[PDB]
């Protein structure tokens, strides 16, 4: 997904 959201680590 991301950074900083659901199935991921912070930005």
Q: CA 5 from chain center: how many Å? A: 4
Cα 8 to Cα 4: distance, rounded to the nearest angstrom:
6
The token duo for 9 is 């680590």
Q: CB–CB of 10/4 below 8 Å? A: yes
Close Cβ partners of 2 (under 8 Å, ≥ 6 residues apart): 8
Instruction: List Cβ neighbours of 3 (8 Å cut-off, separation of 6 or more).
Output: 9, 10, 11
Residue 10's contacts (CB-CB under 8 Å, 6 or more residues apart) are: 3, 4
The string over 1-11, giving b where at least 16 C-beta atoms fall within 10 Å of a residue's C-beta and e elsewhere, is eeeeeeeeeee
Distance CA 1, CA 7 (A): 6
* Experimentally determined by: NMR
What is the DSSP annotation of 1-11?
Answer: --SSSTTS---
């Amino acid at each position: 997904v991301c950074c900083g959201y659901p199935l991921c680590h912070p930005c």
